[PDB]
Amino acid sequence: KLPPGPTPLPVIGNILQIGIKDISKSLTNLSKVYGPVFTLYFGLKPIVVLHGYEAVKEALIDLGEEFSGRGIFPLAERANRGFGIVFSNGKKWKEIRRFSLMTLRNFGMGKRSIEDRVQEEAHCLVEELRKTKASPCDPTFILGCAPCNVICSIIFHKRFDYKDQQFLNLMEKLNENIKILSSPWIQICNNFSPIIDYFPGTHNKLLKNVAFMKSYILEKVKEHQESMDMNNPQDFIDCFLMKMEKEKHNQPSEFTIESLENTAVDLFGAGTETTSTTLRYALLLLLKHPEVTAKVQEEIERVIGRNRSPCMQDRSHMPYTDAVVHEVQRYIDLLPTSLPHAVTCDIKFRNYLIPKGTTILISLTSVLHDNKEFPNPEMFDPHHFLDEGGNFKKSKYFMPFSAGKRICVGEALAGMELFLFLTSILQNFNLKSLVDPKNLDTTPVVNGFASVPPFYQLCFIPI
Ligand code: HEM
Ligand SMILES: CCCCc1nc(Cl)c(CO)n1Cc1ccc(-c2ccccc2-c2nn[nH]n2)cc1
Ligand SMILES: CCCCc1nc(Cl)c(CO)n1Cc1ccc(-c2ccccc2-c2nn[nH]n2)cc1
Ligand SMILES: [K+]
């Protein structure tokens, strides 16, 4: 017997019982009557919901191999998304993910470290912010460019100028697609139609945008094919190609030019928007709490000077800064239900039989906003990650990147972008609101399965 739940209506299951505006809050309300493990029917499709640390840990960590499937909805097929890492399953996922973790290690692709690629980008970000000449600024475009250029330097071994036309084109297609993918019509309502696609023009537009990106990625693998130094892989493409060489006597291989294009598209997708949004949010929270910004700056000035770039080594000597970055991710909760999981086999889970391929929804909100681990969890307070002495207090409830076998591939890279972009910004600038700080609102704006910050402007005032 599946876990207990609200009795489904015929055909529509429990769809009339969930506010699709704020799915996270509905899931939380259902946990107060059905407890931490409960079943919802998305039109005869059973979804099991895990709410709370204990259930999420039990599934994602204790039974990690069983809860490592990606949940599949019609959008996976309509947008052709199951051929990289994010939406792939089985052998294809296991192999592309294991290759991807190895290649994304700090020194995973040659002498030039990931850290060096981000440090370079952090310098360019600081230069673009100077060019705003301390005038009112929606930082959305600029903060979106930085993480996107890090992905570019990781994949193609060289970053673009922010004014370069091929870059603005890629950036434009990525943003359109992310904005389309974020509509409840595309991510929820059209998924209720298992066979008929009610938005065929939208899916076409998504697939044209991907094609454009895939075409640029192919132009570059050609350029990498001719200038190939075995004994010197520079980037994700060099490492992927020479993985293909080692796979030449073992076809059919999960490593092909097709799976490189699709993997690259996933890294652009996964690695841009969430980092971008987290940065934009961090600046809003620093605007709203200027004392916090001032203590970060004190750590910056004391531990780092004004004569050198920040570097990751500084983070262990900057507990307050580390607490702030950790409290930004915890407070804003950008992926309140992560991405859906699926069980990879039949599994007994607290005396509930969950059949192979049943969709699992993880409430990361329920962990990040635990009111016992983080007292007053709806408040931004760096003290949630500090002890009485001022040292960094780690939390097992810190899961903005999810947990277990599907944990975000970019966990380490995101951690570096956030630490280095934010320390580089505050080492070179003070932040000025156009509205009085006490007025600005910082509560997440939820639209289905994602949180975004409110609109805001600020001035980057050189130090
Ligand atoms: C603050 C930034 C980020 C956050 C909060 C974040 C969070 C997440 C979460 C919650 C997942 C879903 C894990 C699950 O399936 O349960 C995910 C997946 C993933 N993230 Fe990130 N992510 C971020 C940045 C990045 C970056 C920079 C990359 C760059 C490589 C990346 C690559 C991926 C990939 C490939 C997956 C799919 C992993 C898989 O299905 O096996 N992410 N991320
Ligand atoms: C029919 C194949 C055309 C695909 C396509 N490529 C691009 Cl580029 C455009 C720009 O609109 N488009 C067309 C397009 C037309 C309507 C939508 C749309 C916008 C808002 C609400 C619903 C739709 C929709 N999609 N399918 N039917 N209606 C999206 C893309
Ligand atoms: C020019 C191409 C732009 C990016 C994009 N458009 C399409 Cl369509 C794909 C296939 O999913 N992609 C790649 C894609 C891969 C993973 C995601 C994903 C990663 C982590 C957390 C949430 C997202 C997500 N999925 N859907 N919307 N946002 C988003 C986009
Ligand atoms: K149409």
Author numbering: 28 to 490
Published text:
Human cytochrome P450 (CYP) 2C9, a member of the CYP2C subfamily of CYP enzymes, is an important drug metabolizing enzyme and represents as much as ~20% of the total hepatic cytochrome P450 content. CYP2C9 is a highly polymorphic enzyme that includes over 60 classified genetic variants, with at least 20 reported to possess altered activity. The CYP2C9*8 genetic variant, predominantly found in individuals of African ancestry with an allele frequency of ~0.06, is a missense variant (449G>A) that is mostly associated with reduced enzyme activity towards various drug substrates.
The structure of CYP2C9*8 complexed with losartan clearly illustrates the amino acid change from R to H at position 150 (R150H) located on the surface of the protein. The sidechain of histidine at 150 is oriented towards the solvent and away from other secondary structural elements. On the other hand, the CYP2C9*8-losartan complex showed two molecules of losartan that include binding at the active site and the peripheral site, as observed in the WT complex, but lost one binding site in the access channel. The orientation of losartan in the active site and at the peripheral binding site is similar to that observed in the WT complex. The overall fold was conserved between the two structures with a root mean square deviation (RMSD) of 0.23 Å; however, the structures differed in the occupancy of losartan molecules. Interestingly, the structural overlay of CYP2C9*2, *3, *8 and WT complexes of losartan revealed that the F476 sidechain in the *8 structure rotates ~30° towards the access channel compared to that observed in the WT structure. On the other hand, the average KD for losartan binding to CYP2C9*8 was 8.95 ± 0.97 µM, which was comparable to that yielded previously by the *2 variant (9.0 ± 0.5 µM). Importantly, the orientation of losartan in the active site of CYP2C9*8 is inconsistent with the demonstrated metabolism as the site of hydroxylation of losartan is located further away from the heme iron.
